[PDB]
Amino acid sequence: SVEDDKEGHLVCRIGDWLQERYEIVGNLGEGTFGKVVECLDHARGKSQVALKIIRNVGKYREAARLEINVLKKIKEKDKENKFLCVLMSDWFNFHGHMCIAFELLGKNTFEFLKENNFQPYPLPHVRHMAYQLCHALRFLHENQLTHTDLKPENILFVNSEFETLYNEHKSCEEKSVKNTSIRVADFGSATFDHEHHTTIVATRHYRPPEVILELGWAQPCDVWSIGCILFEYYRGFTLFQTHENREHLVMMEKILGPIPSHMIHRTRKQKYFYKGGLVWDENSSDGRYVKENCKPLKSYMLQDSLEHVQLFDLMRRMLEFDPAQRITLAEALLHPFFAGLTPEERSF
Numbered sequence: 001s002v003e004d005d006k007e008g009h010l011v012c013r014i015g016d017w018l019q020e021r022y023e024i025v026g027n028l029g030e031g032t033f034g035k036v037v038e039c040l041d042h043a044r045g046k047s048q049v050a051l052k053i054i055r056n057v058g059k060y061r062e063a064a065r066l067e068i069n070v071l072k073k074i075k076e077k078d079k080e081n082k083f084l085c086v087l088m089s090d091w092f093n094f095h096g097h098m099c100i101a102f103e104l105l106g107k108n109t110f111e112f113l114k115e116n117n118f119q120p121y122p123l124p125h126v127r128h129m130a131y132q133l134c135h136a137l138r139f140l141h142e143n144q145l146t147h148t149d150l151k152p153e154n155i156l157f158v159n160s161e162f163e164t165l166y167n168e169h170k171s172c173e174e175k176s177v178k179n180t181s182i183r184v185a186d187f188g189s190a191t192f193d194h195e196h197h198t199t200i201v202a203t204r205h206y207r208p209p210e211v212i213l214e215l216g217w218a219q220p221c222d223v224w225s226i227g228c229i230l231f232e233y234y235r236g237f238t239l240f241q242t243h244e245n246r247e248h249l250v251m252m253e254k255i256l257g258p259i260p261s262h263m264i265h266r267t268r269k270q271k272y273f274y275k276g277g278l279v280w281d282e283n284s285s286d287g288r289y290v291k292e293n294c295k296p297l298k299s300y301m302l303q304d305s306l307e308h309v310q311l312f313d314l315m316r317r318m319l320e321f322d323p324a325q326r327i328t329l330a331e332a333l334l335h336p337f338f339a340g341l342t343p344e345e346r347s348f
């Protein structure tokens with residue numbers, strides 16, 4: 001009656017039920033953890049929900065039990081539900097598969113970008129999403145918590161319905177999201193201040209230099225991740241398209257400038273350095289890639305106007321090498337870039 005595939009995924013499709021309560025009506029996404037399906041909750045007047053069904057594998061089941069505990073603590077802190085985090089409705093162990101029911105939201109910010117053929121979000125959409133990311137993460141940080149896995153894939157629109165607009169300048173159609181309200185998802189890696197901090201955190205492209213250099217990490221990890229995200233929303237391509245540490249550090253250098261000598265002198269990861277400088281093969285396939293494609297951050301500006309200059313100033317401050325020098329989210333919310341927000345956007 002209950003079937004799992006070779007990888008421990010629960011074999012389930014549209015028309016299937018869980019706990020004689022949740023009825024699967026569609027597929028919303030997939031990750032390494034398993035699957036996310038749309039359900040009608042038959043115990044809640046057929047309420048539409050998103051059900052995250054986790055793989056029947058020990059590592060994933062434990063990571064989901066950790067996420068559940070985090071969502072419960074967040075629920076205790078944000079009673080009013082005004083701090084822009086996914087809202088856990090229920091949770092259960094279903095034959096070895098952990099399942100987390102959430103209030104149904106729209107597409108994640110990466111999927112909307114992918115479906116808009118990587119055509120970037122306009123600056124006003126980027127501004128409101130930044131303001132909300134800064135606000136949402138400032139709350140969790142104030143509660144002694146660090147997300148660690150912020151990435152476009154983990155940010156969801158409350159509603160992803162869009163308007164198809166013909167971009168005159170590109171001679172093609174563009175999908176413009178009608179409502180830029182977002183929510184932060186995936187607390188499977190979220191760590192409290194007093195808990196054990198793994199040496200390595202974050203998805204590579206969104207990994208800060210202090211994690212690469214094994215200098216320990218805290219709340220500033222998330223600020224770096226946001227800077228990476230805002231760039232990706234602005235240009236539509238990842239800032240650090242890398243699969244390797246040495247190449248990662250070279251990119252950071254080309255785009256942002258020299259790695260502070262204080263971080264070099266402190267790191268135990270000396271293989272990346274020779275004579276106090278980053279060491280790399282300029283003639284390898286990575287060396288050539290970086291030298292051709294990785295330019296100073298400023299060069300990626302699409303327009304010269306005041307609002308574009310401020311996005312780049314905020315992003316640069318989000319991408320400060322030294323976590324101690326990195327802008328805090330409390331300071332970010334004060335940046336002149338957010339003066340361009342509409343009163344509806346500012347007020348929440």
Ligand SMILES: CCOC(=O)c1c(/C(C#N)=C\N)c2ccc(Cl)c(Cl)c2n1C
Nearest residue numbers: 028029030031036050102103105185186
């Ligand atoms: C792309 C991997 O994950 C997801 O599909 C996903 C995820 C998760 C997780 N974790 C992450 N992006 C969702 C979290 C909450 C809600 Cl309400 C929904 Cl709809 C979610 N979806 C559809």
Ligand SMILES: [Cl-]
Nearest residue numbers: 195196197198
């Ligand atoms: Cl520790």
Ligand SMILES: [Cl-]
Nearest residue numbers: 204242243244
């Ligand atoms: Cl990787």
